[PDB]
């Protein structure tokens, strides 16, 4: 049940130590359900990173 | 045992029975003069 989403914009850095980022993804299939999510790794625009689970939004990390 | 060379062969080394001290550090107002002879307002007026 793993779903893939391509990123289309990076918002900025987040997390207490700045090691995570807020990035705007767009799903590979069904280009809808725009969800802001966080990435532990470095992010360029247009990353095809997949999702273990989708039903969760993201916020700033303490 | 008058000469120190001959007596050396007998003295025991009693070192590994007694515990050396657990704490052994033995090497406060740096800003306060202890001279007690303060230079006057006039001396600076004459010195400078």
């Amino acid at each position: 049940p793993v779903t893939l989403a391509k990123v289309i914009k990076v918002l900025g850095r987040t997390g207490s130590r700045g090691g995570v980022t807020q990035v705007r993804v767009e799903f590979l299939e069904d280009a809808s359900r725009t969800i802001v999510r966080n990435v532990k790794g470095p992010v360029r625009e247009n990353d095809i990173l997949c999702l273990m689970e989708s039903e969760r939004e993201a916020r700033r990390l303490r | 045992k008058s000469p120190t060379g001959n007596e050396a062969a007998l003295k025991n080394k009693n070192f590994n029975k007694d515990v050396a001290p657990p704490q052994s550090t033995a090497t406060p107002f740096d800003r306060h003069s202890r001279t007690g002879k303060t230079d006057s307002k006039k001396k600076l007026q004459q010195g400078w």
Binding site: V2, S16, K40, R44, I48, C50, L61 | -
Partner: protein, 206 residues
């Protein structure tokens, strides 16, 4: 197809490479593909290579490392633990000999196998720590493909390195067991147990 006669005679086997560039002139990169949609960009398999020793400037810019050949990113990953720093040739001696071991086992392409050992062991979500100044706190997020490429390899080599610690088994034969097993998702091998626990705790932290 003709044997090109040079005064300084060219060996027969290398004359085959006039058609295609191959790793050790034994492994072909045409039949090597990445079985993961997001990992194609960060796994460079398009340009054929002769030996996993290229010596490029891939750390100068932010994402220059995405173009590095996949084989070199493991032989670089081999030489760690101080004493092995700079022993890239030995690490290539580990990779090349292993690929000889890798082909006779499971009968698959050795450089296709290593790509499969990289896609399978990449954890997709990691529970990052969000401690509020000292306390123990964790938060689950995603993992980028670039990190998901690189984290698998470092796990792969570590499992190779400890398999040969105080062990009669050598590093190359440990690696061949490591690579083929972690390519198929073997829970027995390293880079699967260390991966699975990473995604395990991430579920209870989201």
């Amino acid at each position: 197809l003709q044997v090109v006669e040079l005064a300084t005679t060219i060996p027969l086997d290398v004359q085959e490479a006039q058609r295609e560039v191959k790793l050790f002139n034994k492994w072909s990169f045409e039949d090597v593909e990445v079985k993961d949609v997001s990992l194609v960009d960060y796994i460079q398999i398009r340009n054929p290579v002769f030996v996993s020793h290229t010596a490029g400037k891939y750390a100068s810019k932010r994402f220059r490392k995405a173009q590095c050949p996949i084989v070199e990113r493991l032989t670089n990953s081999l030489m760690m633990n101080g004493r092995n720093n700079g022993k890239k040739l030995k690490a290539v001696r580990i990779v090349k000999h292993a690929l000889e071991i890798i082909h006779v086992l499971t009968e698959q392409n050795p450089i296709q196998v290593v790509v499969d050992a990289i896609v399978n062991s990449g954890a997709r979500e990691d529970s990052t720590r969000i401690g509020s100044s000292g306390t123990v706190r964790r938060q689950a997020v995603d993992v980028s493909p670039l990190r998901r490429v690189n984290q698998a390899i470092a796990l792969l080599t570590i499992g190779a390195r400890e398999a040969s610690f105080r062990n009669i088994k050598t590093i190359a034969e440990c690696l061949a067991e490591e690579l083929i097993n972690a390519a198929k998702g073997s829970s027995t091998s390293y880079a699967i147990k260390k991966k699975d626990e990473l995604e395990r705790v991430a579920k209870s932290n989201r």
